Amino acid sequence: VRMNVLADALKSINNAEKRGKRQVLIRPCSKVIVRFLTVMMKHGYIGEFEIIDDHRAGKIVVNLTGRLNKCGVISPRFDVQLKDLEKWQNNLLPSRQFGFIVLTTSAGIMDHEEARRKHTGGKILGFFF
Amino acid sequence: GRMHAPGKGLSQSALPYRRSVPTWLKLTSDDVKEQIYKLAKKGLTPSQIGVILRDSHGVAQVRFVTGNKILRILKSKGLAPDLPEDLYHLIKKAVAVRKHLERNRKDKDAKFRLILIESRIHRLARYYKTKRVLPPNWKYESSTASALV
Amino acid sequence: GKCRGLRTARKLRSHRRDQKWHDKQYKKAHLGTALKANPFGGASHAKGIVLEKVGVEAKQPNSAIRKCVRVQLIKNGKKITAFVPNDGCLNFIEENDEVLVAGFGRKGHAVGDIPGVRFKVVKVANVSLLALYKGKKERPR
RNA sequence: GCAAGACUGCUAGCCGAGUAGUGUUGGGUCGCGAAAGGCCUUGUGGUACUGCCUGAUAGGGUGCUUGCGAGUGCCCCGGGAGGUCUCGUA
RNA sequence: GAAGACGGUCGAACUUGACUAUCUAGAGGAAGUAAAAGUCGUAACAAGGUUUCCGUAGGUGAACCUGCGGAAGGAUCAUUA
RNA sequence: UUAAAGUUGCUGCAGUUAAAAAGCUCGUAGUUGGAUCUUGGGAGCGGCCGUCCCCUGCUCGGCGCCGGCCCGAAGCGUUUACUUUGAAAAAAUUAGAGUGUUCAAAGCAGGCCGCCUGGAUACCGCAGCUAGGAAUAAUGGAAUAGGACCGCGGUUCUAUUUUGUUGGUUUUCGGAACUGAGGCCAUGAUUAAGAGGGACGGCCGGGGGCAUUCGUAUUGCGCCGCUAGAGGUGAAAUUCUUGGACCGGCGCAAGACGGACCAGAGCGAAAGCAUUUGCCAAGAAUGUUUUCAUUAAUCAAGAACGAAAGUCGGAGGUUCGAAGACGAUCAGAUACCGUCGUAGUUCCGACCAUAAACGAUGCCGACCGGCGAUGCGGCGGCGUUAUUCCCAUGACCCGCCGGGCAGCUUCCGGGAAACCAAAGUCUUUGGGUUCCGGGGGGAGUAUGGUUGCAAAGCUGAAACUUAAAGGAAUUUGGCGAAGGGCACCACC
RNA sequence: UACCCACUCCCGACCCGGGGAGGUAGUGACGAAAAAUAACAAUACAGGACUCUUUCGAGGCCCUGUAAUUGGAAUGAGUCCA
């Protein structure tokens, strides 16, 4: 039964990137997937997406480039303090020069270096590189 | 897939995109409510009310021609039965299984399906207690056949 | 872990506790039967009295006989057998002498060529076997 | 009311007529099917091809050559006559 | 205003009796381990010379054997209208 | 005793074959939970982008003011965790700035000709307290409207600043409870998940239970004509027979089982189901513009079913047949084989819960290549047959949809390999949830508990011994395996 | 089966008494920090470094090393006025 829509959708686009497709249709639509693909497009790893609107839970179709390697997820949502950000980004990021981890905060859904420069933590949501 | 059956399945309705009444139907919403009243006075279940209202007069859905659903109108007037129709059908199926098992003792599969039906009853009764429809002291025992239908 | 919930802490703690307690190297130290079975009681060295000298058999690819001295302790009076390590050192031990029995090095296992022993001898007549073998000192009489 | 196209049923003169009679499973306008007689302009040409039965030169059950497997030929009538059809042989 | 006494309370302890946990006689039988040579036969591993194995029953010096129901971890992935 | 031990796996184990999915379902605590509620407007510091102002209000008094605005404030504007700041948080020990104990481990000393001084900080998981933020799981109102808002109209109990110095009055000033009619709002219910339950119509299946009917075959009895033989093995016998064995034919009687059709076919959770007909009760699948609206797979503790054999009371006892009794193979058969033969094999009941109960691979949900058949239901299209015409029905064919047992190829990808569309989406480890195993024996053994009339089922060790026991695969070996070729030291 | 209230403190009528609280020692390889047992010369000998004799061979002042040889400069353990 479907509970975590985010993990299934990101594993779907991960398998689409691994196989070699260019468009993929993920079935559920939440706000969190819209914000995650939003910051995904902001940080330049994938192509521009389309969201189809129905009178139900909608779908998202994404145009894929070959710049992404892995689109993981963390379940459940562990809280992350600012002293413990290096603990996660040392053993989960592949390098310090790239690889970008996202955590939801009181301000919005946003990555780790912007959370460092505005000094606000929150629970962890997912990661990519 | 199914809750008790082993296999999966995919067979359900698919309402269209348009939230609009059909243009070719001039059947007034007050009149639609009047057939809902008289077919409910005939003594049917709201699934049967919906399928006959879709069938004869050819309306897409009650929710588009009106603002409510069928059971909302029935509880607005107050002639709806207090027992839910799915619980009524499941209790009637259970007492039919009990009447079948009254004469047959070695039929183990009927007893197994009886345990499954009682499990489904106990699973749905706590939801109908939780959403505050049924009284909190209501319970389905093994002997309620002359008082409960 | 198999269960990856947010609020499932002592399910996994109980599973770790049970499968840690169901080990062998962990169960060797946390049960009193192992300490009650060892005559040393967790002691490194122990004192004992020699009552006889016995020749023991050996293993299959190396056929010989080895020299084991039978040592009776003072903790419980248990009758155990030790093993004289070096060459030509059996004649220094006779009946009714105090010796310092110790371990051997495999946590109470029969080591190598000699079956049925797990301890050796370090001192005899309050002087070490190394002194009596190398001729560092002289055995008192 | 103009106005021709696309295919099609039957009869080989037309009417009697799809009339008796037949009939399937569930139906319908219902498949099949002559004739006595009349009106008489007086009744079409090229071309194949046919073992038996149920129920068309239909469909399908099934055939013959001699040991084998397959081809050839195989409705009736009149006349000329000869004498065991081929391809390879478990 | 001392000694001493009847009552109350907290009470160490004593006698009788049951019970509980550890160590130690314990006649005797039932078992496995460490090894190089003693008799019957090779039960299983190659159609182990009776295909092997698993549950449940039954007698025997011995591995073992025989019904009943399954398995292929088997020697059959297949037997021609 | 710790790291090595990714051999305790929170990060971060394994479960087909190396140790390990309860036989399979139901189910209470606990765990995990679909989508959706607010965005933008007005202008600026600058070479369109980075800093950046607003996004609930009604009494006391204040950079100010000319009856009115703003500002300071006793009084407040439902609620958890997270996140950052702040207080309170003994010292030494941990980290760490300063200085030549000559270095250093230490110590808090010490330096310029009376003065200068430092002798700090950081950390102190949780839990408790105070604050700007509402992204994330749930809480929350209004649906029989005892729903909000400005108001209209009445009943009861009480505070003083009001009524000639004064004994005394309801008032006025105003506190609280109850309360009748109407107006006012945009008057109050988001949908219908390739989640779930239920209803509807055609149908599908050795799915169940009850009652029926049929088919040979076995054995026995009764009769008929026949002859001295049926028993079995690479080899004989124990067995029955002029008291007619054996075979053929006619009839009767009992019990068992439903061959050929009978399939990598169907149903059931699993064990398991195959002669016809009738009755009852379900259940998956396809169809839906029907109904209810997050009711959701997972399962400690609890319950139903459960091959064969095992025990207990009846009915009938045909074949087969553990034990038991003989003959031969044999040196030894108490084992293979042959002849009788007990319980059991069958039903009605009453029990126990075991298998190689095995896809040796838990359940739910999604994603990632192809191909042809098969079974159900539906969606259409040539054409043939129910004889010839017209539509739908059964059958033939073409192609599609959803679920299921499956099949062929494939470095998708994985693994120790055999192999696997899962045994993949695993160091680029994280979708959720029960059970189970850390070398091999001792041993599923001692003992304790517990169910059982009985065998046993579950839970379940310790001591002691060894460095191996094990899983996949090429090559030599030998087969009381299969299939080929060779030779006058083999045969014809 | 040690010495003393002098340093740090503590009762007590109290500058002045007491304290095996403590301090000072001796034993001590629990453990930690520093740090001796060697440096200086070359004939006796294998040439690496720079140029010629194809290669042995001269200069080799820095030489990598090493043989109970030599005149040597030095400091400590310990003995020992203070």
Tab-separated table of C-alpha atoms (C1' of nucleotides) in Angstrom, chain F residues 185-311:
chain	number	residue	atom	x	y	z
F	185	C	C1'	-23.118	35.772	5.869
F	186	A	C1'	-21.268	34.228	-0.865
F	187	U	C1'	-25.679	31.131	5.419
F	188	G	C1'	-22.144	25.837	6.920
F	189	A	C1'	-20.437	19.384	3.587
F	190	U	C1'	-13.206	20.047	-1.678
F	191	U	C1'	-12.739	15.427	-4.522
F	192	A	C1'	-13.951	10.146	-5.594
F	193	A	C1'	-6.754	7.805	-5.131
F	194	G	C1'	-4.505	2.639	-11.577
F	195	A	C1'	-6.403	2.521	-1.854
F	196	G	C1'	-10.412	0.145	0.642
F	197	G	C1'	-15.882	-1.865	1.851
F	198	G	C1'	-20.659	-2.648	-0.368
F	199	A	C1'	-24.706	-3.008	-4.201
F	200	C	C1'	-26.027	-4.421	-9.449
F	201	G	C1'	-26.315	-7.958	-14.466
F	202	G	C1'	-24.347	-11.951	-17.551
F	203	C	C1'	-21.003	-15.764	-16.409
F	204	C	C1'	-16.857	-18.758	-14.892
F	205	G	C1'	-14.313	-23.344	-11.780
F	206	G	C1'	-12.404	-32.070	-10.538
F	207	G	C1'	-14.317	-24.863	-4.763
F	208	G	C1'	-17.548	-26.960	-0.409
F	209	G	C1'	-21.782	-29.612	2.210
F	210	C	C1'	-26.415	-32.774	1.769
F	211	A	C1'	-29.341	-36.350	-1.066
F	212	U	C1'	-29.170	-39.226	-5.515
F	213	U	C1'	-27.851	-42.363	-10.044
F	214	C	C1'	-24.301	-44.966	-13.211
F	215	G	C1'	-19.636	-47.883	-14.970
F	216	U	C1'	-16.378	-51.947	-15.537
F	217	A	C1'	-13.248	-54.695	-12.383
F	218	U	C1'	-12.340	-57.945	-7.442
F	219	U	C1'	-14.327	-61.834	-4.212
F	220	G	C1'	-18.047	-65.378	-2.860
F	221	C	C1'	-22.538	-68.224	-3.578
F	222	G	C1'	-26.327	-71.304	-7.298
F	223	C	C1'	-26.525	-73.896	-12.204
F	224	C	C1'	-24.515	-75.708	-17.095
F	225	G	C1'	-20.542	-78.903	-20.874
F	226	C	C1'	-15.397	-79.712	-20.459
F	227	U	C1'	-10.532	-81.911	-19.164
F	228	A	C1'	-5.899	-82.641	-14.740
F	229	G	C1'	-4.087	-78.753	-14.002
F	230	A	C1'	-3.880	-72.724	-12.289
F	231	G	C1'	1.210	-70.651	-8.152
F	232	G	C1'	6.132	-68.088	-9.574
F	233	U	C1'	11.033	-66.849	-10.364
F	234	G	C1'	17.771	-65.686	-14.753
F	235	A	C1'	15.514	-71.648	-10.685
F	236	A	C1'	11.970	-75.103	-7.634
F	237	A	C1'	8.884	-75.147	-3.628
F	238	U	C1'	5.482	-74.176	0.314
F	239	U	C1'	-0.866	-72.867	-1.959
F	240	C	C1'	-5.868	-75.633	-3.911
F	241	U	C1'	-7.557	-79.687	-6.428
F	242	U	C1'	-12.407	-86.491	-9.333
F	243	G	C1'	-14.473	-83.753	-1.972
F	244	G	C1'	-14.215	-81.017	-9.977
F	245	A	C1'	-8.930	-77.201	-9.031
F	246	C	C1'	-8.650	-73.839	-13.807
F	247	C	C1'	-11.417	-71.641	-18.130
F	248	G	C1'	-16.021	-70.230	-20.724
F	249	G	C1'	-21.518	-68.806	-20.049
F	250	C	C1'	-25.988	-67.441	-17.220
F	251	G	C1'	-27.904	-64.866	-12.417
F	252	C	C1'	-27.438	-63.284	-7.237
F	253	A	C1'	-24.752	-60.621	-2.990
F	254	A	C1'	-21.143	-57.368	-0.537
F	255	G	C1'	-17.321	-53.753	-0.400
F	256	A	C1'	-13.649	-50.513	-2.676
F	257	C	C1'	-12.472	-46.919	-6.757
F	258	G	C1'	-14.258	-43.521	-10.328
F	259	G	C1'	-9.467	-45.486	-16.237
F	260	A	C1'	-9.162	-43.978	-21.356
F	261	C	C1'	-11.127	-37.981	-22.005
F	262	C	C1'	-7.267	-36.355	-17.636
F	263	A	C1'	-3.469	-31.103	-20.017
F	264	G	C1'	3.634	-27.591	-17.402
F	265	A	C1'	-5.324	-27.137	-17.456
F	266	G	C1'	-9.089	-24.957	-13.296
F	267	C	C1'	-10.577	-24.004	-7.991
F	268	G	C1'	-9.261	-23.457	-2.623
F	269	A	C1'	-5.370	-19.356	2.329
F	270	A	C1'	-2.972	-24.360	3.063
F	271	A	C1'	-3.687	-29.646	3.569
F	272	G	C1'	-6.591	-31.037	-0.979
F	273	C	C1'	-10.136	-31.854	-5.103
F	274	A	C1'	-12.221	-36.196	-11.679
F	275	U	C1'	-19.869	-40.868	-12.704
F	276	U	C1'	-24.929	-38.158	-13.580
F	277	U	C1'	-28.750	-35.032	-11.493
F	278	G	C1'	-31.135	-31.833	-7.687
F	279	C	C1'	-30.843	-28.174	-3.231
F	280	C	C1'	-28.127	-24.393	-0.034
F	281	A	C1'	-24.241	-20.883	1.018
F	282	A	C1'	-20.051	-18.090	-0.616
F	283	G	C1'	-15.828	-16.404	-3.408
F	284	A	C1'	-11.521	-14.041	-7.396
F	285	A	C1'	-11.972	-12.144	-12.386
F	286	U	C1'	-13.813	-8.837	-16.123
F	287	G	C1'	-18.327	-4.232	-16.907
F	288	U	C1'	-19.800	0.440	-14.456
F	289	U	C1'	-20.747	8.366	-15.543
F	290	U	C1'	-23.695	3.085	-8.770
F	291	U	C1'	-23.011	3.623	-3.372
F	292	C	C1'	-19.766	4.741	1.687
F	293	A	C1'	-15.702	8.202	2.185
F	294	U	C1'	-9.495	7.252	4.425
F	295	U	C1'	-12.773	2.379	6.552
F	296	A	C1'	-5.492	1.106	5.119
F	297	A	C1'	-1.352	-4.434	3.686
F	298	U	C1'	1.729	-5.890	8.497
F	299	C	C1'	0.760	-8.881	12.780
F	300	A	C1'	3.073	-9.798	20.434
F	301	A	C1'	-0.841	-11.911	23.536
F	302	G	C1'	-5.438	-14.877	21.446
F	303	A	C1'	-8.747	-18.388	17.638
F	304	A	C1'	-10.541	-21.792	12.967
F	305	C	C1'	-8.671	-25.438	9.282
F	306	G	C1'	-4.869	-28.941	8.726
F	307	A	C1'	-1.863	-35.129	3.945
F	308	A	C1'	-0.577	-39.841	5.827
F	309	A	C1'	0.023	-42.795	10.015
F	310	G	C1'	-1.053	-42.748	15.929
F	311	U	C1'	-5.315	-43.824	20.322
